[model samples]
Target: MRISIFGLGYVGAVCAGCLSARGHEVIGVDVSSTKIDLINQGKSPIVEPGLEALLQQGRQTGRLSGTTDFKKAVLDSDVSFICVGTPSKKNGDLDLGYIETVCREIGFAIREKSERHTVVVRSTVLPGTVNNVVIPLIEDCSGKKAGVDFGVGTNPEFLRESTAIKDYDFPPMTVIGELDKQTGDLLEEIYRELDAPIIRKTVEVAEMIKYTCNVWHAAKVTFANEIGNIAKAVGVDGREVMDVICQDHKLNLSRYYMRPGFAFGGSCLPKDVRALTYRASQLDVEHPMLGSLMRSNSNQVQKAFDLITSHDTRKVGLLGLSFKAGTDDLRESPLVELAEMLIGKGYELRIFDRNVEYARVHGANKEYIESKIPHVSSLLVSDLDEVVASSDVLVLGNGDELFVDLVNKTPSGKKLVDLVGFMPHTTTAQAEGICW
Candidate 1:
């Protein structure tokens, strides 16, 4: 693959070195004459370790060169990568001035070319920037339609500052967001030798994935520091505490609770978070992240309530009333709170949960049912199909396998509200998911 990389900064310089090393001709482009000169002399323009050696080898192999002429680079190379900087403005929003300049240059260069040129943004920008901002500007400048006359895509780089070369060679995953298959196929060829899975997604999703990863990393760091502060206040080693927490891969480090869904409830999470935050407050430790957990969780429940009531249907049936699936425990169940809210609002509501019904009959959780939610227990019915048949709206409250088949066959005129993500990305006309 003959590639032209715009901007010879950290990401661009490393990409030039790594891709050239992988037997592709690389043309490094930059407005700065010094950066172009440094790369032309077979030296890295950036300070990444082992990058200069790769550049020297690439130059020695006659597969790498640097040029300040964007037009020449686009005319020579088949694909162009926008690796320009997207630094923040005064108000923390992204300053896309650099990206705009690069796009204008590439678009003008592409206008002079006869063959189809694939332009991919490797810079970190928000989700709609590619399809919304970049494509529009390029199409206007080049007088060429995207995905037809030329191609546009996004390939977010995961390379860290110091370990850029190694990270480029072996990232956690390679994400390709393509406006056309032709562009994606070319990108696949460019990274075919790398030891990572290639994930293809829509242009917007791929753009969002980059920001999600970085922000999640920032949140993780702050969370750990806040925990460390609390641990120190209580005279315990924070590192040791976090080390033990990290060891539990089943829950801590895994994707068990990473999904976007209904509010987390039932027993451990909500109670423990509240207890810890309260203790942190008492110890004079300012833990905002820990403090916000309960508020965030409560907001999710309110969101579910708003979704359920938005259908304008009075008759409502709730499936899986427990906090989660395969459990009879109703303690701290967000579904129970939702149910109470609906009943309080005078919506004729019917509930069906096999486990909760069994518990109601078999004496387990009978006391909690009798004392706390005697009114709610009175609404529970044995026949699950009866609730679906009778109600005008159905709510999938938990991840019960039984609800999957029921939700699939839901008739028209009945609104189905999903909070558990049971049937993800449901396309049923009458169905709505809280988060997809």
Candidate 2:
């Protein structure tokens, strides 16, 4: 993999070291004579984590060197990575100006070559920027068609400032948004040695993915700090909260609670969120992200409320009303809240819960039934068939094991409004999930 990286900066510096280590002859391109001189001397053009180790070794075998000659580098390499450096200001696409000038040179350089070339845009450009700007500029200058004479792509870099080198060594994920098969294949093979998932996507999707990642990271930071703010206001260690959440690789540490889902109203989540939000308000701490937690949770109920009403079938039967399944605890349950809302809306409603019905019986959990619902013992039906027989619309409220098969038994023409994704995708015709 003899490769040329245009721009002797961070992404370029990292590439020089990492790629050369994997046995690629690295031709690092730079506009600065000093930078090219530094690399040629077996010293770092920039201070980097692993740059000198590879760049220095490149000098050992004459496989590594820096150059101001973009034409020579492009003419001599198997592939070209356009990683031109930008201004130090707060901008990712800050210096398309630098890319514009360099790519013009690239276009002119490509005109001199007869063989196919892959031009990967390692800069941050928007979705349509490739077809609208990059390809047009290069094709106009070279008088050649893209995807025929040349190939263009976006290989977005997720580099952190301090440990940018180490991050490249082990990226969380690798994404390439290339315009053509030959171009994508060439770039993919270059990163064949990397220990990360290489995600191949359409150019626009790949470009947008970079923005999605950065914006989520920024949101996570603010969410963490706001969690810390509320935690400290209530005299608890915020780091402990974070450290514990980080440990649960199954859910908290992974992608479990990240997705939009039912309003979390088990015994724990709603109360805990309220406690933190209340503390934040009390301490005059303006934690907007944390503050939105309960409002957001409540909004899911409203969404469910709207879904139930909009379905327009009056009789609504709830499958499970406990905050979570296999529980008799209805305290602060969102389903209970939903039932209350529908009842208030004058929609005929009935409840069937094996656990809740038993809990209030003869009656041990009567306190909860007494507190949460009306003298609603009449509304509680012992038989599942009894609830199903009455309501035109059935709502699956929790992840109860019993409800997983309930969809199998749904009667003709009864619409299933799913609060939890218990029903099969095969069941979307008869029922709609809250958010799949």
Candidate 3:
């Protein structure tokens, strides 16, 4: 395939070298005369391992060429990859001027072309950028319909700085967010030789996946540094501790608690997070992330409270009152806090948790309930049907199997607030989730 890359920066330079090395006819377009001259002279404009050699080989084989003429590049190539930089502005917003300029240039070039061209954005951008900005700009400039006369998509680059070549050759995965099937198909074929799974999604989701990976990496670094600080203060090796933690991939390094849902509240998580942060403080160590755990958890509870109250209905039926399903333990339960908040706000609330009622009658958590939260205890009802029938708002508080039936049974007039993602895509008109 004949491919034209819009920028001759790090990502574009590496892509030109690698794609040319993979036997594709490659054309690199850039405004910098120095960069264009370097590529044409069979030299790498930027320093990268094995990049100059590939460009030299491409020049020798006549498989790669560099030009400032974007029009000729677009007319000669079947596809174009936008690899321009999206730098941060003063207020931390993305400076998409480079992206916008490239799109307009490419759109004008695409205007003169008679054949269909696929435009793939390899730049890191916020979600909805391609759909909201790029596609619109191209359609307006070219006077052509997207997915009809031209194709557009997002193929987020995951290449790190020093290891860019290898990362491109063996990426973790190939994600293609396509506005048209032809764009996805072309991208899939371009990456077909790589030994990685290809995930196809909408343009926005693909854009979001790039940010998620980068932000998650940032969070992991902060988390490890925080743990290291606490460990150093406590006379322990943080590296060894983290190494052991990574060994438990089933839970520790897995997607166990990665889902977006209600606040975490069980006996162990809330208690251990508090203990660790408190001990860190006693040792005069500041654990910002650790210290923010309880506060963040409380904010989640507040968000839930605010969402529930937004319905403006007085009667609310809460299903599953315990911290989680299949357990009667209410120690540090966020649902208990939410119930208290609703009661304080003067909402008529009825809670139905089978395990809690059984514990209340059978002597487990009875004293704690009768003494600590006797008000909430009094609001607990034994029958689920009674609570559902009496209330105008139903809150699914936990992921109990019993509540699966209630997901569909939620009536049209009453709002269903899902704190747990029992059914994330519940299409009921009155359904709302804390985070979807």
Query: For candidate 1, which ten residues in a row score worst on lDDT?
Result: 420-429
lDDT of 1 at 35: 89
Tens digits of per-residue lDDT for model 1, 335-428: 9999999999999999999999999789667889878898898899889889988998899999899898876677767888888776656535
Decoy 1 TM-score against native: 0.97
Off by over 4 Å in 3: 424-428
lDDT, each prediction: 0.90, 0.81, 0.90
Report the C-alpha lDDT of model 3 over 328-393, residue by residue, as the tens digit.
Answer: 999888899899999998999999999899998896568998888989999998898899989998
lDDT of 2 by residue, 1-436 (tens): 7888998776777777767777888788888898889888888866666667777787898778889998999888878888876454455344467777877888888997998877888877768878877888888889888998998888999988668778887888889996788888887887777899899999998988897888889988998999888778778999999988888889766877665458887768877878867777889989877768788888899988887787757899988877877678877888888888888778888988888878877557786576746644458888888888888899988877877666877778788888877766634667887875
Better of 1 and 3 by TM-score: 1
Indicate the TM-score of model 3: 0.96
lDDT of model 1, residue 50: 97
Clashes of 2: 0
